Scaffold this active site. Structure first.
Site, PDB file in Angstrom:
ATOM      1  N   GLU A   1       0.822  -1.203   0.000  1.00 13.63           N
ATOM      2  CA  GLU A   1       0.000   0.000   0.000  1.00 13.63           C
ATOM      3  C   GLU A   1       0.860   1.259   0.000  1.00 13.63           C
ATOM      4  OE1 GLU A   1      -3.641  -0.423  -0.043  1.00 13.63           O
ATOM      5  OE2 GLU A   1      -4.111  -1.076   1.999  1.00 13.63           O
TER       6      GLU A   1
ATOM      7  N   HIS B   1       2.353   2.053  -3.373  1.00 18.92           N
ATOM      8  CA  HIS B   1       1.343   2.723  -4.186  1.00 18.92           C
ATOM      9  C   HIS B   1       1.222   4.195  -3.809  1.00 18.92           C
ATOM     10  CE1 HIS B   1      -0.963   0.070  -6.924  1.00 18.92           C
ATOM     11  NE2 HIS B   1      -0.529  -0.914  -6.158  1.00 18.92           N
TER      12      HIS B   1
ATOM     13  N   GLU C   1      -0.161  -2.056 -10.774  1.00 18.70           N
ATOM     14  CA  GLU C   1      -0.099  -3.089  -9.748  1.00 18.70           C
ATOM     15  C   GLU C   1       1.020  -4.083 -10.030  1.00 18.70           C
ATOM     16  OE1 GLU C   1      -2.925  -2.212  -7.795  1.00 18.70           O
ATOM     17  OE2 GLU C   1      -1.729  -3.075  -6.167  1.00 18.70           O
TER      18      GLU C   1
HETATM   19 HG   LIG Z   1      -2.785   1.999  -2.325  1.00 17.33          HG
END
Ligand SMILES: [Hg+2]
EC number: 3.4.24.69
Length: 421
Positions: free
Chosen positions: A223, A226, A261
């Protein structure tokens, strides 16, 4: 140590690092109790009913629609004890990430990744973008705006839908134009996914009950990676997807995985994006850093009284690793850009963190979730900063026995199976 205070959820508010805050969403909201665990990083131990107007409550969608891999529980994270545990769990996971050289580098980059001050419609003036701040209730009851980079918040209706959310600008694609924006990470330390050790099993939708549990530290790191991309405005448009043709079951269902991703996972997955596009993306975000430097050079004064023009110009020269001559004119050095771009996209990857944590983990993003477990990582007897579940000097130290949900069965309660459905 990354979190200097061991917050208890019931600690009195002080309007500084324990405060009732409001989120700059288009709608109304009651203030929520928030905790500043680090410069520019806040934690809201609440279910995210705020960032998305379409997700204003905690009930699943009752319109003949239901995603297979999902889990619902409207009472999770509603009591003070749960909120206390959530806060200590998230804190523990940040320290575990900070305990590695790779995590320290990522967290340093994230703190440095101040969203760009591009809210000014006048070129000669530098101005903040309001949606990159929160409103903190002060001890006199009044609000003050505080800039921040990262918010950790509870999940919305779907407990296991972990994702980054951020507020958009009317004109600007802040996560994909180099500007960046404050990132709201929906995350829970109280659940984790099960996966299979054998590759052919893990990537088959019909096999496996999820013998091994994912270390939640890896999930948060994924996370945070990202969020690093989106804070530096280099996130790849999720419409750019890789039509998986290396997994017969993915193809059978025509599953597409976003390049963003695949990049975040790293390892072999990141190689599915061929050179032509990789080069295209790099050059694309190199130009965005050029426009940022071109915006800074035109700014001759600053808006507001929170900091000097000189200070904010230096904050962004350090974020974007810009070059500066004696007159203060900024430019982008391709070498230094490639250095930072590779750092954010190739060094910070899930597969690299697996190496630093010495945990067992899914070998590819292109697998099938097997099950979701209830976990409690707060007790030191369950989970430590330095070892996760594989506690040193116990039977769980070896062979990732700590993540083996059959051997370490006291630390995992299986709540749902995903195999077959
Ligand atoms: Hg994220």
């Amino acid at each position: 140590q990354f979190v200097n205070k061991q917050f208890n959820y019931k600690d009195p508010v002080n309007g500084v690092d324990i405060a009732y805050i409001k989120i700059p969403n288009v709608g109304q909201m009651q203030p929520v109790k928030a905790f500043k665990i680090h410069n520019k990083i806040w934690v809201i131990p609440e279910r995210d009913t705020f960032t998305n107007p379409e997700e204003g409550d905690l009930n699943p969608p009752p319109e003949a629609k239901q995603v297979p891999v999902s889990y619902y529980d409207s009472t999770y994270l509603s009591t003070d004890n749960e909120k206390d545990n959530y806060l200590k769990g998230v804190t523990k996971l940040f320290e575990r990430i900070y305990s590695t050289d790779l995590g320290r580098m990522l967290l340093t980059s994230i703190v440095r990744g101040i969203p760009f001050w591009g809210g000014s419609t006048i070129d000669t003036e530098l101005k903040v973008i309001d949606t990159n701040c929160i409103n903190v209730i002060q001890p006199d009851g009044s609000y003050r705006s505080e800039e921040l980079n990262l918010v950790i918040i509870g999940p919305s209706a779907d407990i296991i839908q972990f994702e980054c959310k951020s507020f958009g600008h009317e004109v600007l694609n802040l996560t994909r134009n180099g500007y960046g924006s404050t990132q709201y990470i929906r995350f829970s330390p109280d659940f984790t996914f099960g996966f299979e050790e054998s590759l052919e099993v893990d990537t088959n939708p019909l096999l496996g009950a999820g013998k091994f549990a994912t270390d939640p530290a890896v999930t948060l790191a994924h996370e945070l990676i990202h969020a690093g991309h989106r804070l530096y405005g280099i996130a790849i448009n999720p419409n750019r997807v890789f039509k998986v043709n290396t997994n017969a079951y993915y193809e059978m269902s025509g599953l597409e995985v976003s390049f963003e991703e695949l990049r975040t996972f790293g390892g072999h997955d990141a190689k599915f994006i061929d050179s032509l596009q990789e080069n295209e993306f790099r050059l694309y975000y190199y130009n965005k850093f050029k426009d940022i430097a071109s915006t800074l050079n035109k700014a001759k004064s600053i808006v507001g009284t929170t900091a000097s023009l000189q200070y904010m110009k230096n904050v962004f020269k350090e974020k974007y690793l810009l070059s500066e001559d004696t007159s203060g004119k900024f430019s982008v050095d391709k070498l230094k850009f490639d250095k930072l771009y590779k750092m954010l996209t190739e060094i910070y990857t899930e597969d690299n963190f697996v190496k630093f944590f010495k945990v067992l983990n899914r070998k590819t993003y292109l697998n099938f979730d097997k099950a979701v477990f209830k976990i409690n990582i707060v007790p030191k007897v369950n989970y430590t900063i330095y070892d996760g579940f594989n506690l040193r000097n116990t039977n769980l130290a070896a062979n990732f026995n700590g993540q083996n949900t059959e051997i370490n069965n006291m630390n995992f309660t299986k709540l749902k199976n995903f195999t077959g459905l």
